[PDB]
Amino acid sequence: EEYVVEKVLDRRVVKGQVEYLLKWKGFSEEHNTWEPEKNLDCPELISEFMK
């Protein structure tokens, strides 16, 4: 259930939570998922995105 993240692609705010669209490392783009911010352990990828 924990996986290496490759890139943070997008961000949204839904139902009171920030969610990020993640491209998982080694997985095709058809496996991308939105994940709430509490699930993320990739602060430097969020930072790259926020540029």
Assess 1 for contact with another protein (CB under 8 A): yes
Residues 11-50 that bind another protein (CB under 8 A): 22, 24, 33, 35-36, 39-42, 44-45
Largest CA distance in the chain: 31
CA 8/CA 16 separation, integer angstroms: 20
Closest approach of another protein to the CB of residue 16, in Å: 16
Contact between residue 50 and residue 37 where contact means Cβ atoms under 8 Å apart:
no
Binding site for another protein (CB under 8 A): 1-6, 22, 24, 33, 35-36, 39-42, 44-45
